[PDB]
């Protein structure tokens, strides 16, 4: 259908139309029954209370999409040269992209072969030239994804100030990135949004972080996702170790945003920053919602 | 070479079964090996064999074959490569009218 466009971008940077309009150009098509590639894979947790169990919270799960595809030609060899080419666009250890194109927009989901595939029918694949590959393939990331959004902030004051508009579209909390530049004193907000994942959610409200100071050359990475650490330092110094337990807490929470002030001080060359904010989505196409 | 003499038919070859007629004989009776006399070449039934007597006519004497198959097929053919006739079921039936 034209509501709707699959693609895939292997690994080596093959493009692949799997549905919508040009599927089955490069001779790979999609076959129906596609699990687990709508909704992230979401399980509850319920403890044991007064009238059964009680909700304890949620814990999002990574996908495994099982799925289909034809390889077809007229030629027997041409198929084999298909066949091979779209086995090459996968891999186990590096990702590749997989774009679902509505009217929402464009949204991709990284993916890996979770084990290998399982190709052909039963007699063998020359004599059709027309074969399926079953494909179990898993996000490890299971959010479908867009270009994040980046802003950059450049000042040659000793002393500034600036404010970043930011705002989560998307129905699933992100975590922002900020690159500073050094040398300088920075401080970054860390809102709760109104999370009260520590207690504090409207304690937290307009809650600003200092960094430690930066000495020349220490350029600092501040990633507030939870997989990477908040503070890396490019030149491998531990600016961590000055900073004295304080911490990036919060994400941005769905539907909030507003101008978060971002300062520099004690900067003698000015300061650089750029702020980049994920855009999650659980669905790979959903109306605008708020 | 012309058609007739490709074909090569011959109507003498056919024969009809203008009277037929079923013998039956206990599985203690020697089976009939052959039903040609050795001395002149006649019809010789063998003792222990006895005849039904008549027998419908429009509902004839019928011969069925049935034949049990598998078909064979190798991984690179896409048509089964062989068959085989596993058995050969045969049985016949007719109408017996004398009691």
Same mark, same amino acid.
Request: one cysteine or more; charged letters at 25%; aromatic letters at 12%.
């Given at each position: 259908t034209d509501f709707l466009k699959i693609e895939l971008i292997g690994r080596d940077g093959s493009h692949w139309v $799997? !549905?919508?309009?040009?599927?089955?150009?490069?001779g790979v098509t999609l076959n129906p029954? $596609?699990?687990?590639?709508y909704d992230a894979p979401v399980k509850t947790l319920y403890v044991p209370g007064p009238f059964g169990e009680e909700y304890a919270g949620k814990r999002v799960q990574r996908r495994e999409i099982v799925f289909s595809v034809q390889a077809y030609d007229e030629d027997p060899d041409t198929w084999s040269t298909v066949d091979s080419l779209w086995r090459w666009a996968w891999d186990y250890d590096e990702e590749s992209e997989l774009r679902v194109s509505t009217s929402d927009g464009t949204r991709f989901l990284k993916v890996r072969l979770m084990e290998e595939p399982k190709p052909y029918y039963?007699?063998?694949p020359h004599i059709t030239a027309d074969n399926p590959i079953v494909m179990t393939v898993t996000a490890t990331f299971p959010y479908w994804q867009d270009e994040p959004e980046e802003l950059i902030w450049t000042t040659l004051s000793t002393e500034d100030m600036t404010r970043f508009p930011v705002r989560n579209d998307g129905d699933v909390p992100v975590w922002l990135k900020w690159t500073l530049t050094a040398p300088g004193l920075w401080i970054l907000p860390d809102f !709760?949004?109104?999370?009260?994942?520590? !207690? &504090?959610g409207r304690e937290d409200l307009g809650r600003t972080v200092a960094m430690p100071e930066l000495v020349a050359g220490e350029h600092v990475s501040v990633d !507030?996702?939870? &997989?990477?650490?908040?503070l890396i330092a490019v030149n491998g110094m531990?600016?961590?170790? &000055?900073?004295?337990?304080?911490d990036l807490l919060y994400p941005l929470m769905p539907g909030k945003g507003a101008e978060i002030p971002v300062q520099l001080k004690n900067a003698p060359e000015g300061g650089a920053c750029k702020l980049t904010r994920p855009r999650w989505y659980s669905r790979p196409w959903s109306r605008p919602g708020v | 070479t012309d058609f007739y003499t490709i074909k090569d038919?011959?109507? #003498?070859?056919?024969?009809?079964?203008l009277n037929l007629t079923v013998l039956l004989a206990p599985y203690s009776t020697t089976p009939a090996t /052959?039903?040609?006399?050795? /001395? #002149? +070449?006649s019809l010789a039934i063998p003792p222990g064999y006895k005849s039904v007597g008549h027998f419908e006519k429009q509902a004839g004497l019928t011969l069925g074959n049935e034949f049990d198959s598998k078909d064979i097929e190798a991984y +690179?053919?896409?048509?089964?490569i062989r068959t085989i006739i596993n058995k050969r079921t045969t049985t016949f039936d007719f109408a017996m009218y004398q009691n």
């Amino acid at each position: 259908t034209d509501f709707l466009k699959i693609e895939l971008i292997g690994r080596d940077g093959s493009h692949w139309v $799997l !549905s919508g309009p040009g599927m089955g150009q490069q001779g790979v098509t999609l076959n129906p029954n $596609l699990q687990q590639f709508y909704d992230a894979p979401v399980k509850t947790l319920y403890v044991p209370g007064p009238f059964g169990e009680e909700y304890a919270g949620k814990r999002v799960q990574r996908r495994e999409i099982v799925f289909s595809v034809q390889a077809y030609d007229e030629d027997p060899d041409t198929w084999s040269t298909v066949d091979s080419l779209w086995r090459w666009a996968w891999d186990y250890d590096e990702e590749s992209e997989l774009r679902v194109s509505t009217s929402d927009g464009t949204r991709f989901l990284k993916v890996r072969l979770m084990e290998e595939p399982k190709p052909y029918y039963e007699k063998d694949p020359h004599i059709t030239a027309d074969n399926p590959i079953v494909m179990t393939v898993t996000a490890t990331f299971p959010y479908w994804q867009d270009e994040p959004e980046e802003l950059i902030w450049t000042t040659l004051s000793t002393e500034d100030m600036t404010r970043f508009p930011v705002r989560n579209d998307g129905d699933v909390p992100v975590w922002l990135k900020w690159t500073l530049t050094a040398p300088g004193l920075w401080i970054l907000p860390d809102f !709760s949004w109104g999370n009260d994942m520590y !207690s &504090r959610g409207r304690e937290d409200l307009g809650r600003t972080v200092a960094m430690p100071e930066l000495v020349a050359g220490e350029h600092v990475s501040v990633d !507030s996702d939870p &997989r990477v650490q908040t503070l890396i330092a490019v030149n491998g110094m531990p600016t961590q170790n &000055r900073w004295k337990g304080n911490d990036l807490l919060y994400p941005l929470m769905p539907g909030k945003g507003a101008e978060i002030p971002v300062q520099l001080k004690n900067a003698p060359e000015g300061g650089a920053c750029k702020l980049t904010r994920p855009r999650w989505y659980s669905r790979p196409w959903s109306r605008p919602g708020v | 070479t012309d058609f007739y003499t490709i074909k090569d038919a011959q109507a #003498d070859l056919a024969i009809a079964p203008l009277n037929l007629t079923v013998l039956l004989a206990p599985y203690s009776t020697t089976p009939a090996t /052959t039903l040609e006399s050795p /001395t #002149d +070449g006649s019809l010789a039934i063998p003792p222990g064999y006895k005849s039904v007597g008549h027998f419908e006519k429009q509902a004839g004497l019928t011969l069925g074959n049935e034949f049990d198959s598998k078909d064979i097929e190798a991984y +690179g053919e896409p048509e089964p490569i062989r068959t085989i006739i596993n058995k050969r079921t045969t049985t016949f039936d007719f109408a017996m009218y004398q009691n």
